[PDB]
Design a protein around this ligand. Structure first.
Ligand SMILES: CCCCCCCCCCCCCCCCCC(=O)OC[C@H](COP(=O)([O-])OCC(O)COP(=O)([O-])OC[C@@H](COC(=O)CCCCCCCCCCCCCCCCC)OC(=O)CCCCCCCCCCCCCCCCC)OC(=O)CCCCCCCCCCCCCCCCC
Ligand code: BCL
Ligand SMILES: C/C=C1/c2cc3[nH]c4c(c3C)C(=O)[C@H](C(=O)OC)c4c3nc(cc4[nH]c(cc(n2)[C@@H]1C)c(C(C)=O)c4C)[C@@H](C)[C@@H]3CCC(=O)OC/C=C(\C)CCC[C@H](C)CCC[C@H](C)CCCC(C)C
Ligand SMILES: C/C=C1/c2cc3[nH]c4c(c3C)C(=O)[C@H](C(=O)OC)c4c3nc(cc4[nH]c(cc(n2)[C@@H]1C)c(C(C)=O)c4C)[C@@H](C)[C@@H]3CCC(=O)OC/C=C(\C)CCC[C@H](C)CCC[C@H](C)CCCC(C)C
Ligand SMILES: CCCCCCCCCCCCCCCCCC(=O)OC[C@H](COP(=O)([O-])OCC[N+](C)(C)C)OC(=O)CCCCCCCCCCCCCCCCC
Ligand SMILES: CCCCCCCCCCCCCCCCCC(=O)OC[C@H](COP(=O)([O-])OCC[N+](C)(C)C)OC(=O)CCCCCCCCCCCCCCCCC
Ligand SMILES: COC(C)(C)C/C=C/C(C)=C/C=C/C(C)=C/C=C/C(C)=C/C=C/C=C(C)/C=C/C=C(\C)CC/C=C(\C)CCC=C(C)C
Ligand SMILES: COC(C)(C)C/C=C/C(C)=C/C=C/C(C)=C/C=C/C(C)=C/C=C/C=C(C)/C=C/C=C(\C)CC/C=C(\C)CCC=C(C)C
Ligand SMILES: COC(C)(C)C/C=C/C(C)=C/C=C/C(C)=C/C=C/C(C)=C/C=C/C=C(C)/C=C/C=C(\C)CC/C=C(\C)CCC=C(C)C
Ligand SMILES: COC(C)(C)C/C=C/C(C)=C/C=C/C(C)=C/C=C/C(C)=C/C=C/C=C(C)/C=C/C=C(\C)CC/C=C(\C)CCC=C(C)C
Ligand SMILES: COC(C)(C)C/C=C/C(C)=C/C=C/C(C)=C/C=C/C(C)=C/C=C\C=C(C)\C=C\C=C(/C)CC/C=C(\C)CCC=C(C)C
Ligand SMILES: [Fe+2]
Lengths: 305, 65, 260, 281, 54, 44, 65, 54, 44, 44, 46, 54, 46, 44
């Protein structure tokens, strides 16, 4: 049996420059190389990428954020390349201490650089959101990607900006560092009682597990009906074929209800968005309204005592 | 036999079941013998249980050491 | 605002969780309503509407404006299938199989089913045809893997029924779609790539045997393929898995059939 | 009853066991031999959880908990009231999941489609069996498995994680978490892209796959394609679950200490183990 | 009350009877388990006390 | 007279009558059981 | 089949062996499943034996009382 | 009660009998497990207390 | 005549009669078992 | 004559008779085993 | 009880016998586990 | 109030009756469980105290 | 080893199969008795 | 070519092949049982 997991023979020809409605092509670059390695799985063509005003804004801000964290990491190793190599995962760019509160008077070396890098990150992420919206608009498409990204941005903003302001301290944002931000996560859980007893934390976990579930389900279904041209979904929405029917009937005979080629993607987008939506709500309530979630669960019929 | 739904199997599997059957004849007879012997021993053990052997009780007839 | 209650133990944590329960109920209703746009209303096995339609009512219709002047599709709408189905019901009660009356693969019922789509090729974004043979495409060449052109094609019974002539590719998508496989009748058939196992010396087709290669629905025009005939070819090739099961030389199938 | 198009697909055959004994439908549900089995197992398991609720003394659904046998019972049986109900419910759940997978095989098979779906469900079944069967058997007792309670198996997760300090430092754990986050990201992007193509700016024509490739190439510069995105989704989910099963099978079995102590090896590697400065030293 | 029979020109008997059987069994199991949960009306424990079993 | 399931008036009356006979039989058995339990041990 | 020495049995016993065979197909499959499961559990138990779980040994994750 | 037989002009015997067999076996297993769970009526433990197996 | 399964009146009566014979046989075995258990150890 | 499986009356009787012979053989072996276990160690 | 034989004009013998074999083996294994669980009637202790 | 009957030219009787049955059963279970939860109006405990079953 | 089959041109299958069944059952009962005799491997304990 | 029994070469080969299939099935079940017992409690 051929499982359709990897292409067994590849083809290529002229590069596709893409559709040309309401798009300024002065900003679109030239097509890049073809990758035979990427071609065994999906498309082999790289580029062209669109480079606009927001593209340059986002590139500048993100590059400076990454560079600022890197320069702090180099300082923190004593400028030693070997120490930088060995402690790359242990370095950290840590926010101001609690006694500064929300003030921008923290010296350069316990959190002025954190504030600078955070400003760069803010500009980069919001520029990228605007760029997503405008790239969708230029082609006459819907703005669904912008709103899903907005959900992700909501969680990010709560973690780094809104919750520190509500608690009145920059010390409660997330440090820039691999193991350091993992320890921030663990210590956030320890300080507020179990986050396991945060109901919105549980909902967020439910929707992350549901994302993995639904997307295994959908990938498997589409690969199983790809023998009828099932992977061509816009056309199956346009003109229903036997792949769509067989998929619907499989799920109807399995669990009693099914979806449409169109509607399974509404399920998918909402399942993925609810993760960060409920996560942001839970983190915002965490500490501002409840500071011991296990006791809250005891009070709300969740924990035995 | 009017059933005529078992006759459709191939002759090789007919042979197969024929000799599976030969062996279960042989050792079903052997099993009947063994388990009837155990039931006889069990009957005598029950009769021994219900009698007051278990209270007044004989010494060993032979030394065995 | 830590820990003051409006009533009982009810605080912003509780208000948020109950608001989310209500929102989730509404969202589930909306999602199912969107998913009731194909296949409804429900019907008895004899075609008449069922007494069932469900707790969820049908949504209001919406219109897709098809590209390239193909028209409009508005859903939900009146769905018939514009073709006759050659099946006869097994029982008088419901929930029982309908057995094929003639040849199952080939009246097109069961796993060999197909759908009356538009007898037109699907188009790419620029208006040309989407799927196209290698010779008709300019600049395309087999780029990696075992080039299947020139290999014999073996069926599920370990006969060779033809051999590969050309590849049909999908232009924007840059991937092979059909094997043009030509028989010593001389006519050509189309083979979906996901139904063929391309080996070093041989193109194996588990679905079909030699005697069924001739029956594959041929293509109206010889450089293009329409949606209808793609269903037709795909449905027959796929229904070959059950309906050509007897004719197949599989070790495990013969294993189990001899035991059974 | 039936979808507008369902009748031409309701044909006999394509089933593993039992001919046409159970080759019928009950409403929309296809029954089959394994459907009979899975209904039996699911019903019995839910009943036994209710009987656990009765024995324990609560009717609060969030407080009902079915604990596995304690550590002293080892891998043997326990009284129903203090660990045996958990064992019967575990057998019922395993049977229900396996019968569900085999029933899915039968349905995939009547419809003439590939078996990717029972494939992918087998991965989740194996992760569950790792947590409930493989690791506790390899590790000595049924008491290392998790209880069947809504908020009490979270206690099991927390205790097991903190037995080894911050569980974030398990490396297979990090790989699994990265796969899960990438999976959610890909799902959001895919759903959004297809919906935005099918539902364009409002009243103008429906989009094409070319528009999807154009949008995403404008965004980041490499579109993967429809077949690519579905492959990547299946593989991301399956890799996440596989690395979860791995990170938990190695925990408490070949690793017994704090996991940052595992990360300690890179730091002590010969050509930097002695340099002063930095975080380490 | 006399013309309640017209409910069967509204509902298909097969579906209604399946639903009714499921509902009745579930309700009976519900009430029996509720009775078994309370220290009184748990007829098992009550008998075990009556006949000096445990 | 609706006609959603396809039954006529006489069929409806016949089916409802046999249903109600079954329903009252079930109810009678339930009442006997309830009286037995009440006499054995009252809950009021 | 050329053996032609098993074909002399009466049709009733042919039916008999046919259904003895049906039942051993069914529950031989079931036995294969059960005993393969036990062999899997045994493999994991052996791997647990050979590892030093048995010396440094984790505390109970859940109370169970 | 005389004409209950017309239930078989409503229900297909095959499906009903499969469902009934499954239901009866599940109910029997239910009740046996409930009896085994209680310290009394767990006939195993009771006979082990009778014959001094512990 | 109402008909959903395809069976006629005589077929229905025959099948129901053999069912009920089986049902009462099952019930009799259950009653014997229940009396045996009750005598062995009452629950009332 | 329902004939869902297509068997006739005589075929049904023959198959049921051979089934029941097998069933009573199985039951007899079970009773012998149960008596052996009961004598070895009672559960009542 | 006399005409129970007509069950075989309802059910195909092959399927019924396969299902019955599977059921009987599974039930026997079940009961063995029940006996194995109790400290008495567990023969795998030694 | 006289022409409330026109609701049935708005709503399909089948769906309304199914929803109404589900709603009524759920509400009754709600109220019974609320009564059982409070130490008073938990008729079970009240009877058990009245006849001294503990 | 290949041509051991000709044993069946020496021995009548019916008699050989009866004898073999009897022998195998007797041997199994024998060994279950040797195991039962030793204090360990006597599973009938408890 | 002795033929005390009366069988020919092809009959002998067929009977021996089906015997050996049965013998290896028996042997496989025995090996599975032996491995199960050995894992449960070794004798070496
Ligand atoms: C009367 C009595 C009173 C009753 C009161 C109670 C009411 C109960 C209601 C129960 C629920 C009913 C069903 C709800 C879901 C309906 C979805 C739907 O209908 O989709 C149709 C529609 C389909 O569009 P389409 O047909 O495919 O487009 C075709 C067009 O050609 C192309 O169109 P397009 O490309 O231009 O797309 C435009 C549209 C389509 O969007 C999409 O394409 C789908 C994208 C899905 C992801 C969206 C989530 C993004 C999250 C943003 C930020 C999250 C953090 C916010 C803070 C958290 C809250 C504290 O975009 C949006 O609608 C999303 C805008 C998001 C802004 C959020 C700002 C903050 C919240 C403010 C609330 C109001 C929001 C807008 C409401 C009006 C919208 C017109 O999609 C939507 O409109 C999305 C609805 C957004 C709902 C609100 C989003 C957040 C929800 C928060 C939940 C919090 C619960 C409480 C917990 C904590 C409390 C303390
Ligand atoms: C001991 C540790 C604690 C705990 C502490 C926390 C904390 C604290 C938080 C979570 C959060 C989450 N946890 Mg938890 N968590 C625990 C146990 C678990 C378990 C488990 C089985 O044990 C699971 C499955 C989860 C799962 C989850 C997720 C559902 C959720 C995060 C959603 C997400 O994707 O965020 C990842 C996604 C984002 C952060 C969004 C990022 C968006 C921006 C725009 C990205 C910008 C990229 C940037 C520019 C870089 C560019 C790179 C280049 C382009 C290459 N937790 C225990 C109890 N968990 C979060 C949450 O929402 O909780 C309610 C959270 O804050
Ligand atoms: C629904 C909730 C899910 C979700 C959703 C979505 N996420 C989106 C979109 C949607 C819908 C987009 O449309 C958008 C995008 O374009 O995708 C291709 C985006 C992105 N999500 C990124 C990262 C990310 N998502 C995470 C999580 C989830 N996301 C959750 C699970 C996580 C973690 C930690 O889990 C990470 C790290 C970037 C790849 C990208 C922003 C790039 C940026 O802001 O660059 C700006 C920053 C730079 C250019 C810095 C570059 C640094 C130097 C140059 C090197
Ligand atoms: C990549 C791997 C992913 C993945 C994969 C797939 N998953 C699938 C499929 C695929 C592909 C299917 O095809 C199949 C299906 O048809 O879906 C609709 C299925 C399903 N995924 C379910 C749940 C689920 N997936 C999870 C995880 C992922 N899945 C991972 C991430 C998680 C968690 C916690 O993460 C959950 C809860 C059910 C909805 C459903 C099985 C229903 C069942 O088996 O019913 C049979 C069982 C019952 C009806 C009830 C049995 C109740 C027992 C007896 C009592 C149990 C109590 C319990 C032990 C304790 C409580 C605490
Ligand atoms: C992103 C959205 C959130 C989904 C995540 C899950 C949230 C948690 C709540 C469980 C819901 C899971 C998804 C199902 C939602 C809709 C289900 C549905 O439409 O049922 C109709 C179907 C009816 O079939 P049908 O819909 O095809 O009937 C056709 C007629 N209409 C459409 C009009 C109804 O119900 C079923 O047959 C299966 C039952 C589904 C619910 C099973 C959940 C079990 C949970 C056990 C907990 C106790
Ligand atoms: C034929 C003759 C067979 C005789 C004995 C057969 C032995 C079987 C192999 C057992 C492996 C072993 O070595 O035992 C040592 C252990 C002894 O445990 P222990 O804790 O007492 O001692 C530790 C072991 N030592 C010290 C010897 C290393 O026994 C077990 O492993 C018990 C496993 C029970 C298996 C029952 C599974 C039921 C079937 C369904 C499975 C699917 C759902 C899983 C859920 C299970 C219940 C929650
Ligand atoms: C916490 O909550 C607690 C438990 C404390 C309290 C709970 C309270 C709840 C609300 C209790 C709910 C009770 C419900 C509402 C009771 C409903 C009872 C009635 C509606 C059930 C009906 C029973 C009738 C059955 C037995 C019918 C039997 C008839 C069959 C024998 C055959 C008849 C079927 C057809 C008509 C016959 C053949 C037809 C021919 C003409 C072809
Ligand atoms: C937790 O709650 C607890 C457990 C405490 C309490 C639980 C209480 C619950 C509610 C108990 C529920 C009990 C149910 C309602 C009992 C139902 C019993 C009856 C309906 C079962 C019927 C059994 C009859 C069977 C045995 C039929 C046997 C007949 C066969 C032998 C053959 C007959 C089949 C056909 C008709 C024969 C051939 C047909 C020919 C003519 C073609
Ligand atoms: C948790 O709850 C527990 C488990 C503790 C207690 C629950 C117990 C459950 C509820 C008990 C359920 C028991 C079930 C209902 C018993 C059913 C047994 C079935 C009816 C046994 C039927 C056996 C049929 C025999 C095997 C049929 C054999 C047919 C022959 C093989 C056909 C050919 C017969 C010819 C060859 C002549 C006879 C001589 C030979 C060698 C058979
Ligand atoms: C005191 O000394 C002690 C006991 C401690 C140690 C002494 C041990 C003694 C010395 C060991 C002696 C061992 C003997 C030599 C072992 C001999 C074993 C015999 C050779 C085994 C042969 C078995 C033959 C099998 C059962 C043949 C089966 C043939 C089939 C029944 C024919 C058809 C095959 C079908 C039924 C099976 C596959 C096809 C289907 C339809 C399932
Ligand atoms: C040799 O290599 C060189 C040096 C050339 C460059 C290499 C650099 C490498 C070492 C870079 C390493 C980067 C680290 C590892 C990246 C880690 C990032 C961590 C994981 C981010 C995790 C969470 C951060 C999120 C939550 C931050 C959220 C903050 C936003 C909400 C924006 C905050 C808004 C600020 C506070 C507003 C302040 C406004 C102005 C006035 C200060
Ligand atoms: Fe898709």
């Amino acid at each position: 049996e051929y499982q359709n997991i990897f292409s067994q023979v590849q083809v290529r020809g002229p590069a596709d420059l893409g559709m040309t409605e309401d798009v300024n092509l002065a900003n679109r670059s030239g097509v890049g190389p073809f990758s035979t390695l990427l071609g065994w799985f999906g498309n082999a063509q790289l580029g062209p990428i669109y480079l606009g005003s927001l593209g340059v804004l986002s590139l500048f801000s993100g590059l400076m954020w990454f560079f600022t964290i890197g320069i702090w990491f180099w300082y923190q190793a004593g400028w030693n390349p070997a120490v930088f190599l060995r402690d790359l995962f242990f370095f950290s760019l840590e926010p101001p201490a609690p006694e500064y509160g929300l003030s921008f008077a923290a010296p350069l070396k316990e959190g002025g650089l954190w504030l600078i890098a955070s400003f760069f990150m803010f500009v980069a992420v919001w520029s990228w959101w605007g760029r997503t919206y405008l790239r969708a608009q230029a082609l006459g498409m819907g703005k669904h990607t912008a709103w899903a990204f907005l959900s992700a941005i909501w969680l990010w903003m709560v973690l780094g900006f809104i919750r520190p302001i509500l608690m009145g301290s920059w010390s409660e944002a997330v440090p820039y560092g691999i193991f350091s931000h993992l320890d921030w996560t663990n210590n956030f859980s320890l300080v507020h009682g179990n986050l396991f007893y945060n109901p919105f934390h549980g909902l967020s976990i439910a929707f992350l597990y549901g994302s993995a579930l639904l997307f295994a389900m959908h990938g498997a279904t589409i690969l199983a009906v790809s023998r009828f041209g099932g992977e061509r979904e816009l056309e199956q929405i346009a003109d229903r074929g036997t792949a769509a029917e067989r998929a619907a009937l499989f799920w109807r005979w399995t669990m009693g209800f099914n979806a449409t080629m169109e509607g399974i993607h509404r399920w998918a987008i909402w399942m993925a968005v609810l993760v960060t939506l409920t996560g942001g709500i839970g983190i915002l309530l965490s500490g501002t309204v409840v500071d011991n979630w296990y006791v809250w669960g005891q009070n709300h019929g969740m924990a035995p005592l | 036999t009017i059933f005529n739904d078992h006759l459709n199997t191939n002759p090789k599997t007919n042979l197969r079941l024929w000799v599976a059957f030969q062996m279960m004849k042989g050792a079903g007879w052997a099993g009947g013998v063994f388990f009837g012997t155990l039931l006889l021993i069990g009957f005598f053990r029950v009769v021994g249980r219900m009698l007051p052997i278990q209270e007044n009780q004989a010494p060993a007839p032979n030394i065995t050491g | 605002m830590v820990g003051v209650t409006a009533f009982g133990n009810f605080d912003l944590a509780s208000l948020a969780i109950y608001s989310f329960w209500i929102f989730l109920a509404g969202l589930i209703y909306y999602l199912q309503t969107e998913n009731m746009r194909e296949g409804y209303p429900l019907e008895n096995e004899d075609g008449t509407p069922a007494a069932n339609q469900g707790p969820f009512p049908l949504p209001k219709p919406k219109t897709f404006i098809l590209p390239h002047g193909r028209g409009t599709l508005t859903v939900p709408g009146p769905e018939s299938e514009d073709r006759p189905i050659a099946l006869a019901r097994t029982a008088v009660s419901e929930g029982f199989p309908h057995a094929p009356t003639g040849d199952p693969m080939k009246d097109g019922v069961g796993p060999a089913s197909w759908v009356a789509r538009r007898d037109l090729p699907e188009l790419d974004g620029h208006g040309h045809n989407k799927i196209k043979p290698m010779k008709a495409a300019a600049g395309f060449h087999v780029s990696a893997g075992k080039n299947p052109i020139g290999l014999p094609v073996r069926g599920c019974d370990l006969e060779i029924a033809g051999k590969v002539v050309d590849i049909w590719v999908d232009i924007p998508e840059q991937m092979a779609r059909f094997l043009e496989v030509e028989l010593k009748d001389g006519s050509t058939r189309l083979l979906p790539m996901q139904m063929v196992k391309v080996q070093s010396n041989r193109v194996h087709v588990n679905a079909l045997s030699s005697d069924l290669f001739a029956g594959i629905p041929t293509i109206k025009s010889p450089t293009e393929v329409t949606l209808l005939e793609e269903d037709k070819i795909c449905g027959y090739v796929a229904g070959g898995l059950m309906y050509a099961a007897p004719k197949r030389k599989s070790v495990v199938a013969a294993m189990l059939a001899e035991y059974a | 009853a039936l979808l507008s198009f369902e009748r031409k697909y309701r044909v006999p055959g394509g089933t593993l066991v039992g001919g046409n004994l159970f080759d019928f439908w009950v409403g929309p549900f296809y029954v089959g031999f394994f459907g009979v089995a899975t209904f039996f197992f699911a019903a019995l398991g839910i009943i036994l959880i209710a009987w656990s609720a009765v024995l324990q003394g609560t009717w609060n659904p969030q407080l009902i908990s079915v604990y596995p046998p304690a550590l002293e019972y080892g891998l043997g049986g326990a009284p129903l009231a203090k660990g045996g109900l958990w064992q019967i419910i575990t057998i019922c759940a395993t049977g229900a999941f396996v019968s569900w997978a085999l029933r899915e095989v039968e349905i995939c098979r009547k419809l003439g489609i590939g078996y990717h779906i029972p494939f992918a469900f087998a991965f989740a079944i194996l992760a569950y069996l790792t947590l409930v069967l493989f690791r506790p058997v390899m590790m000595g007792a049924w008491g290392y498995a998790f209880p069947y309670g809504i908020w009490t198996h979270l206690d099991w997760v927390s205790n097991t994680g903190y037995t080894y300090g911050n569980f974030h430092y398990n490396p297979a754990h990090m790989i699994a978490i990265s796969f899960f986050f990438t999976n959610a990201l890909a799902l959001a992007l895919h759903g959004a892209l297809v919906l935005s193509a099918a539902n364009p700016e409002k009243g103008k024509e429906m989009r094409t796959p070319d528009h999807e490739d154009t949008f995403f190439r404008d965004l980041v510069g490499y579109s993967i394609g429809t077949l690519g995105i579905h492959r990547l989704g299946l593989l991301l989910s399956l890799s996440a679950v596989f690395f979860s099963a791995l990170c938990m099978i190695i925990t408490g079995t070949i690793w017994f200490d704090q996991w940052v102590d595992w990360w300690q090896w890179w730091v002590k590697l010969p050509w930097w183990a002695n340099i002063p400065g930095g975080i380490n030293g | 009350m006399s013309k309640f029979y017209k409910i069967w020109m509204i509902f298909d008997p097969r579906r209604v009877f399946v639903a009714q059987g499921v509902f009745l069994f579930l309700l009976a199991v519900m009430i029996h388990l509720i009775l078994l949960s309370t220290p009184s009306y748990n007829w098992l424990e009550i008998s075990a006390a009556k006949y000096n079993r445990v | 007279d609706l006609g959603y399931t396809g039954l006529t008036d006489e069929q409806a009356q016949e089916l409802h009558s046999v249903y109600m006979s079954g329903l009252w039989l079930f109810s009678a058995v339930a009442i006997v059981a309830h009286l037995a339990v009440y006499i054995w041990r009252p809950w009021f």
